[PDB]
Amino acid sequence: AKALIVYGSTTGNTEYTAETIARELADAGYEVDSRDAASVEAGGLFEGFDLVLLGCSTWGDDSIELQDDFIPLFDSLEETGAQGRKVACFGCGDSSYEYFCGAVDAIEEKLKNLGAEIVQDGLRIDGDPRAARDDIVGWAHDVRGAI
Ligand SMILES: Cc1cc2nc3c(=O)[nH]c(=O)nc-3n(C[C@H](O)[C@H](O)[C@H](O)COP(=O)(O)O)c2cc1C
């Protein structure tokens, strides 16, 4: 099985989350390609992957803003080959904001409308993902069981 993980992370929490997922997947035998959104090209990006996981923190406080490095990929998701693709999303946020993990919501809805197959509800991490490390592992399990 081939997995792509693409993360947008400003302070490293969604990156940590991505690394934790990647290790879970690889330990189970998946091929895993992990890329920072800051360096990816959207065109054809999901091509040849059995599973794509997109990670993005939420910013903006009074509005939903996606993690800065992830915006160009978001704005180009129609060119990624999401139709029929198995995908799931994750990201860090903080529930004291009005729009908790709103980036995850946004990405999920964009993927769905593109015809992607969302194989699991998004992983919405409240606070430090190091304090949610067992939720991360479990979600990576759930994703493997859902494909
Ligand atoms: C000024 C500021 C604004 C934020 N806005 C939100 C928000 O609107 N929604 C949310 O759920 N978290 C928000 N957060 C929390 C960040 O998502 C959180 O710090 C997260 O761990 C950053 O993950 P990253 O290091 O992967 O970028 C904000 C954080 C800061 C400091």
UniProtKB/Swiss-Prot annotation:
Q: Which UniProt keywords apply?
A: Electron transport, Flavoprotein, FMN, Transport
Which Pfam families does the record match to this protein? Flavodoxin_1
Which cysteines share a disulfide bond? none
List cofactor names only: FMN
- Provide a Gene Ontology MF annotation, just one: FMN binding
Q: Which InterPro entries match?
A: Flav_short, Flavdoxin-like, Flavodoxin, Flavodoxin/NO_synth, Flavodoxin_CS, Flavoprotein-like_sf
User: Where does the Flavodoxin-like domain lie?
Assistant: 3-144
Role, per record: Low-potential electron donor to a number of redox enzymes.
The family annotation for this protein states: Belongs to the flavodoxin family.
Protein name from the UniProt record: Flavodoxin
What is the originating organism of this protein?
Nitratidesulfovibrio vulgaris (strain ATCC 29579 / DSM 644 / CCUG 34227 / NCIMB 8303 / VKM B-1760 / Hildenborough)
